[PDB]
Amino acid sequence: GSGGGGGMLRVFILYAENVHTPDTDISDAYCSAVFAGVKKRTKVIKNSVNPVWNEGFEWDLKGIPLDQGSELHVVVKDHETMGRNRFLGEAKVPLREVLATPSLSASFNAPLLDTKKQPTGASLVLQVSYTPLPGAVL
C-alpha cells in the first residue's frame, strides 16, 4: 500500500554464485539487488580483500512503506517489483516475514540453482532487515 514511511532496508547477500560464466568475459547476472524497482549495487573501488561481490544492498523506505506484499529480487532477472505469479524457486524474498517478526530482521536461503540444481550443501544466505527511522509501527 501507501501512506507513512521512514525506514532503512538492509540486505546482505554474503557472496552468491552463477554471476559470470566466462573467466575473462562476463555474463548478465551481475551482483545487484532490487526492492521495488530500484536496482543498485556497491562501487567496490577499493582493494578486493572481500570475497563478496555484492557487499550488501540498502534502500530507503522514506517515501515507500515496507509492505507485506513487497518482494526482494536478487540477480535472477533485470528487476521485478511485483511477483504474484508463482515462481519455480527464484530468489524472491517475502518482506512480510520481517514485519511479521518483532526482530525486524530475518535470514533467507536463496541460492541460484540453474533449474534442478537444488541445494545439497551450498546455499546463498541473504539477510533482510527493516530498520524504522522514526520507529513507526507500520
Swiss-Prot record:
Q: What is the effect of changing D78A?
A: Fails to bind calcium
User: Coiled-coil regions in this chain?
Assistant: none
Indicate the segments forming the C2 domain, all copies: 8-108
- Effect on the protein of changing V74D: In MMD1 and LGMDR2; Reduces calcium-sensitive phospholipid binding and interaction with AHNAK and AHNAK2
Chain positions recorded as Ca(2+) 1 binding sites: D25, I26, D28, N47
Per UniProt, subcellular location reads as:
Cell membrane, Sarcolemma; Cytoplasmic vesicle membrane; Cell membrane
Tissues of expression? Expressed in skeletal muscle, myoblast, myotube and in the syncytiotrophoblast (STB) of the placenta (at protein level). Ubiquitous. Highly expressed in skeletal muscle. Also found in heart, brain, spleen, intestine, placenta and at lower levels in liver, lung, kidney and pancreas.
UniProt domain comment: All seven C2 domains associate with lipid membranes in a calcium-dependent manner. Domains C2 1 and 3 have the highest affinity for calcium, the C2 domain 1 seems to be largely unstructured in the absence of bound ligands. The C2 domain 1 from isoform 14 does not bind calcium in the absence of bound phospholipid.
How is the subunit organization of this protein annotated in UniProt? Interacts with CACNA1S. Interacts with ANXA1; the interaction is Ca(2+)- and injury state-dependent. Interacts with ANXA2; the interaction is Ca(2+)- and injury state-dependent. Interacts with CACNA1S and PARVB. Interacts with TRIM72/MG53; interaction is required for transport to sites of cell injury during repair patch formation. Interacts with RIPOR2; this interaction occurs during early myogenic differentiation. Interacts with CAV3 and PARVB. Interacts with AHNAK; the interaction is direct and Ca(2+)-independent. Interacts with AHNAK2; the interaction is direct and Ca(2+)-independent.
Disease entry from the Swiss-Prot or TrEMBL record? Muscular dystrophy, limb-girdle, autosomal recessive 2: An autosomal recessive degenerative myopathy characterized by weakness and atrophy starting in the proximal pelvifemoral muscles, with onset in the late teens or later, massive elevation of serum creatine kinase levels and slow progression. Scapular muscle involvement is minor and not present at onset. Upper limb girdle involvement follows some years after the onset in lower limbs. Miyoshi muscular dystrophy 1: A late-onset muscular dystrophy involving the distal lower limb musculature. It is characterized by weakness that initially affects the gastrocnemius muscle during early adulthood.
Per its database record, what is this protein's job?
Key calcium ion sensor involved in the Ca(2+)-triggered synaptic vesicle-plasma membrane fusion. Plays a role in the sarcolemma repair mechanism of both skeletal muscle and cardiomyocytes that permits rapid resealing of membranes disrupted by mechanical stress.
Q: Which family does it belong to?
A: Belongs to the ferlin family.
**Under which name does UniProt file this protein?**
Dysferlin
Which residues of the whole protein does the chain here span? 1 to 130 of 2080
